[PDB]
Design a protein around this ligand. Structure first.
Ligand code: PLI
Ligand code: PLI
Ligand code: F0G
Ligand code: F0G
Ligand code: K
Ligand code: K
Ligand code: K
Ligand code: K
Lengths: 458, 460, 465, 462
């Protein structure tokens, strides 16, 4: 495992504390053995998500201080519009308060747009993999969310350069079975979050866009971690070996018609989202009409002016290769520490998290008894580290192909010594993994259990 | 006209400038004679809205700096939960990114909850006056938005203590006509924004709630300007003349089962919203299930942790009577300046804006030629001040006739001084003779729905 | 009285409260009837100084956030150097933590410089009027501080354009009587704080510098309020009627060899100072050597990097004419309110404060009983406003006589911070003082309960008679 | 070498970059081969000082935002007064803009106080080791600055618990030789910065104060790094095994009559200083009278209100044992990395820096040719790391004074750099082991008369 030094220094700190073993046992019981219900005061190192927990720079805080809070015509709305033209060559923007607000703006408009002339009678969305909120919006609008990630993403320990790729054969098969008139949109998720923050190749993005364009299908780029995808392209595609990150990004977005973005990831923000449209002015107008009642007026979209200002600066800082190299290298360091100790992970590591394969880490625990959650609760009790489950506990009442515990790493927040604490904590549980029991419900809500369900050890 | 001194001093300033007469001309041209299309750089004093443009305190900024940005279980979420229990006596909260986000969380849930056993086949919402986004969400969910403000709200120059009240007779008539089983909810809007920021009396709130409870109707308090409403109750209701503002708030929320709040108003924030539920845990769980896909996880609701921290502090600052006295007194000062010069306004002034009655101000322009908008564009070109609402332009088409056609001079909180107010009043007064020669306005580009935002007009 | 609207809007507020009459009486008694001992918690509107209480802008705060805190070679030190070259055409800068630290850097160096050839045997400094700290550093270094402001400054109610002018006749007389070899430096104070914030004309600055240069005398511009002085020059000198503020400033500093500046005044800061030297590299080297043990390393001079960053932005904002017009107009507004009500003041009002002439205002209390302090205490008890005394209480006792020094003026200074209070705050101040018009006759004198030997106005405890 | 994990996480970052080899050589030439004259833009990792470069907490920034900027009676002045009473049990405070301003306030006052009744005609100050500005203020006022640190400090590689102690024998000898009536004050520097940030033991502080009280000598604690000194006392003195840091601090300040503090060190600030006096109201009044013309009015002392507010918060954070353990552990980690690789350092590492013994590293350069400065200039050109010299360059009388030690100080700001930054520093210096024998001395081009190392320009001797 190789430690990479920070291309920055610390300007402001925030205290953290390790609760005592008895505090965490009380806290985990009070939360019903669901870390989602733990207060942050009971957590030492928080690896629940990489969303909205990033450390901003002094230039970002400076930009917030001079932010224009105007309800209409904010100086920062035009700066953001100019930034999206520079980065993506897209001509229209609609800010949103975060990524699922951006999805709420655009997806219903795409369905309405497709439903013209009696099309989309059995409408579907096709992605390499829909994120949970993305699939929820697909399903809320009466559509089905189809995921066709490459089969290589389900072979955890088998290296592949592009585990986020579309399965091109499945894409064509789905276009032939459902019909282009039923495909509301293709959603390219970069990186593919649910497959392990795994990158999609430039040539895979290109072939998907070519296929969609010959069938007249609209392509939306889910762009939460697009800078981490661009870095992987430059690292692993020889055609982009000497390209800048911004040149990679500029090429990526030739292969979509629009983007939905959670700026709470790669743009290094604590809040914020964006809709950007390449040139379809009609879809832009319809999305603006939905933005008004759902998010806010069209030049702030549910965001304070200061946060649009922070987004403009963070959009730049997130494309800096020296930072991406350290950021992604830190994820790779925690992953190497675990692999060296025989802990199975999604290999290679993705851009934002280490996905520990708990299906083989605790085989004695069946899927319905939530093996990855049992490992997560044990990691929390032993260490105060909070991780998130991506398996059977997520999206149930059901069986899952993968059972990952996601160690999600906020950007510029934790040091490699924090990584060592995380790795050593999981390594010290190797003898307890065999004797580990499963989990059964105490209270189960009808929907969205993983967020607010209560469990108990069997 | 009496100037009230600030119960604070300035700690941070923000530059503004008057663009030249030439620049203002060119600017309004490129904006198609629509101020909603103007960039902020073309505006001197911005009276478009009082939403999200407020000046925060140093204590609010300090709260943001130590805000907990955690995805789940943020320290500031629990503080906000305690604060809502303190102010409203409500046991459950769901943060939202702003007011219409709160409405998107709660209104679909109330509809689905009302339809649980097969009733509410013709669902409606009843309010003293649904705000634009509020009425939009009820209609996007298939219901009708029924507005029943008191008739006194329609006699502008004639003083009344409570021009935001419900018409209780119309409330009972609509219950009988549609049936209680079709009334998804009653929405008590305080202050009543569309009536001129005019207050609702405590006894009006009390009677509406009791009528609703005997019929089993859920009551929601639209709370964007609840502190300004509480101030007016203390000022005009003898029962509360000697109560604190917090005691008036506490009593107000005995007459609702939940609230939706834009924290961008009376809590003195630039962003933020809130859903609070008194004790109905089933509705709380259903609203939480909708908050997840629409806004965010249930312990931040589409807000940065620092904005929840700012909301906990701002909810306290917004109830302080010394501040409310100055805030509402500054709006009254602007109104008294225009009223003493013979400019008709909604009298008495509300809590957050002066509503200039343009029907009597420019009678030679019909409603379909947008008279209030003509006054606004004339005001802008004269001074650089940007105002909003046209009644007609806002009402749109079905062009439905407008009961009123106000120009709204909306005042952000703790932002402008009374010398800024003198500039606004003197600019409008200086136009008195020009209102006669004032031209109507016609569309050059017209969008269908939501024309007030993006239509490119041109002078007739 | 004409209210001038703010050329800005408010972005952040600080709560203030009026303490109850009971609290104000208790606090003043606890403070020994000396508002300088009051905590800020007992003050509503604080008019003690215009120093370091200013409201900064969002651009100033943004500049602080990205400030470079390096010990040596801070990015903001080089920006400050470029800014002083732009504003003043001065080639060398030494930051200081505030104005009196800038005086502590420069004044002892000038004395040692003048002593190089065995000169300055009876050294003196000559100013239109040394400020208190300026005079203290002169005297601490064994020199005498000579003030020669125009006689017009002492005619309180008689208007004049330039009540801060040097008396040119006295300048030549002092040069002849002391000799150019004994005059360590001429200090041009702009505006002239002690004369009431009154401006110095460009032609008066020019003639002083011309007289000094032929005699080989080094000229220091005391520049705490140079932007307010530049505004008055543009307002009242026809030659500069169409010049920009920066053009006026650029001309002003042709008539000095260096400057000492409190950035806590016109540059709109809460802390900060500056030494800038036109072109004498030798004096720059000596002042750097004194900066190191007194203030800090030469690229921060006792300032956090963020404060140098704020100073670069505030130097720019302080020169903007629309702000200066509002700022100086607010002072004139408070002055006209009092003047229209019969309250005697230093007329015309200066750049930063209104000086109420309590000699004319009150008669039943003599100078040795501190008349201006009795009004200040009355004003505080009535309103929670804290003002500062510029009279017999401040003047002090004569060590030769051991008794009260006779004071030419018994002023109460209503000192106005920049971009902090509105014209409604001014009305509150004026109405408070006007409402005491009948009570002034029955106001009692003040006597010491505790008197320290030196600098008594800061910590002496008084009691009513 | 053991890495200690941060008891915090990062909230805000500041970019740094590595200037190219050509930029550095251009920069160092323009800087006259004195890194003090280098712009920060030419530095990668800045180890020039631990003074005022620290990273504050969100609680400190929040305190600044609500700071009271009043000229008289600021709310934060009374908080600072209460905090000094809580921490040190001292009744009087005068804020200062930084440490040497605190010295400029107090030292001349102490000389004047001592000169009453016509004594102190040959006035001196005695310290375990005066810091540079401290000795400058002693000498500017016409006194002599006598340093009497333990000889243990001069054996770099031999461990000792308390290499910052006073030599008690030399203390008694200097009192007898000069007379107690000529000792203006004894200055106890904690930690002893010039000895290598090495702690003074509690019993050494006690014995020094007891000797001084029996002779009527005033004692000032130079307190820039008093928390790091308290940590070492708790770590190495068995008597304080079960004591809190604040109990150790409270006990330390029983053994002084006043303190002068650079708040730019252990209180974790970017600016700020403090004078605190235990109970001598007369010296308090005289120091206030000097504070007014030198620093500012006595309730802000040359500080913005926001900086006093940050000081009140940082004074608390600087006492937290979990932070001190990490902070001093990071210094020890850099030291152990260099010591494991054969680099001679002052052992054990002190609180705030690693002191590389260059008299052993580069023997072919004599002291008067500044051997530690030659290692520093070579370190910068190689890596962009800026260090500072503590030897002959820092040190009739104009002839080059002999230096007991020739140190390169790798000074570590608080909560700014990670242990991966420390690895970069260590590998960079380790990587110069074969170039050390080839290094050349340095000669003056411009020499100031006082505190020459700050602004002097040098040239290689080659
Ligand atoms: C690919 C993708 C995501 O990963 C995503 C959010 N992911 C979070 C919540 C995570 O923990 O992965 C979202 C939703 O973004 P939001 O959390 O609404 O800003 C959309 N697309
Ligand atoms: C003309 C002049 C001044 O007015 C001045 C400070 N005057 C203040 C404190 C006042 O209250 O008038 C100073 C001292 O600046 P300082 O307060 O040290 O930043 C120097 N020159
Ligand atoms: C009564 C009322 N309810 C809900 C909202 C929507 O809240 P939001 O989403 O903007 O935060 C508003 C907004 N009124 C603003 C827009 C105005 O009067 O201009 C309102 O006045
Ligand atoms: C022991 C000691 N005393 C006094 C001072 C002066 O304090 P200051 O005026 O800088 O705030 C310092 C500063 N030492 C810093 C400069 C260093 O060792 O790099 C110091 O280490
Ligand atoms: K967040
Ligand atoms: K806003
Ligand atoms: K201040
Ligand atoms: K600093």
């Amino acid at each position: 495992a190789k430690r990479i030094v920070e291309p920055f220094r610390i300007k402001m700190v925030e205290k953290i504390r390790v609760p005592s073993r008895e505090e965490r046992e009380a806290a985990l019981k009070e939360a019903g053995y669901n870390p989602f219900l733990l207060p942050s005061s009971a957590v030492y190192i928080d690896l629940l998500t990489d969303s909205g927990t990033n450390a901003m720079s002094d230039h970002q805080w400076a930009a917030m201080i001079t932010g224009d809070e105007a309800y209409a015509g904010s100086r920062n709305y035009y700066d953001l519009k100019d930034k999206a033209k520079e980065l993506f060559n897209y001509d229209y923007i609609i800010p949103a308060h975060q990524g699922r607000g951006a999805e709420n703006i655009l997806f219903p408009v795409l369905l309405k747009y497709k439903q013209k002339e009696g099309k989309a009678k059995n409408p579907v969305f096709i992605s390499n993999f829909h994120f949970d909120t993305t699939a929820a919006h697909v399903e809320l609008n009466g559509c089905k969310a189809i995921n066709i990630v490459t089969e290589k993403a389900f072979d955890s320990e088998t290296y592949d350069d592009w585990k986020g790729d579309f399965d091109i054969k499945k894409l064509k098969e789905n276009i032939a079975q459902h019909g282009a008139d039923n495909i509301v949109a293709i959603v390219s998720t970069v990186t593919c979050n649910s497959a392990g923050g795994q990158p999609v190749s430039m040539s895979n993005l290109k072939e998907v866009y070519e296929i969609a364009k010959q069938h007249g299908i609209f392509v939306v780029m889910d762009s939460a971690r697009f800078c981490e995808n661009a870095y992987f392209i430059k690292a692993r595609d020889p055609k982009y070996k000497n390209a800048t990150i911004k040149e990679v990004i500029f090429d990526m977005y030739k292969y979509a018609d629009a983007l939905t973005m959670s700026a709470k990831k790669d743009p290094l923000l604590n809040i914020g989202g964006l809709v950007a449209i390449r040139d379809n002015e009609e879809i832009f107008t319809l999305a603006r009409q939905r933005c008004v009642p759902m998010e806010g007026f069209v030049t702030y979209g549910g965001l304070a002016g200061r946060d649009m200002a922070a987004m403009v600066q963070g959009l730049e800082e997130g494309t800096e290769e020296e930072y991406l190299h350290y950021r992604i290298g830190q994820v790779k360091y925690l992953g190497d520490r675990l692999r060296e100790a025989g802990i199975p992970i999604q290999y290679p590591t993705g851009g934002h998290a280490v996905f520990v394969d708990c299906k083989k880490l605790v085989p004695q625990i069946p899927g319905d008894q939530f093996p990855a959650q049992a490992v997560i609760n044990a990691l929390y009790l032993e260490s105060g580290v909070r991780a998130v489950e991506i398996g059977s506990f997520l999206l149930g009442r059901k069986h899952a192909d993968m059972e990952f515990m996601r160690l999600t790493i906020a950007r510029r927040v934790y040091t490699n010594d924090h990584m060592d604490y995380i790795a050593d904590a999981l390594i010290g549980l190797k003898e307890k993994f065999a004797t580990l029991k499963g989990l059964e419900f105490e209270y189960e809500p009808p929907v969205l259990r993983h967020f607010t369900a209560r469990l108990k050890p069997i």
